[PDB]
Amino acid sequence: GATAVSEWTEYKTADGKTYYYNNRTLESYWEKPQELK
């Protein structure tokens, strides 16, 4: 990756949980994708 930093959006919950929602693949990852680094 190391580019296209726009398809990976960070959603922060009030209780302090971070998950990245990727619309490209419709996949939700609770840990940072290697595309982000």
Domains recognised in the chain with CATH numbers: 1-37 (2.20.70.10)
Q: Which residues pair with 28 in a beta bridge?
A: 21
Q: Which of 34, 9, 33 is nearest to 22 (CA)?
A: 9
Contact 22, 28 (CB under 8 A): yes
Three-state secondary-structure class, residue 21: strand
First and final C-alpha spacing in the chain = 8
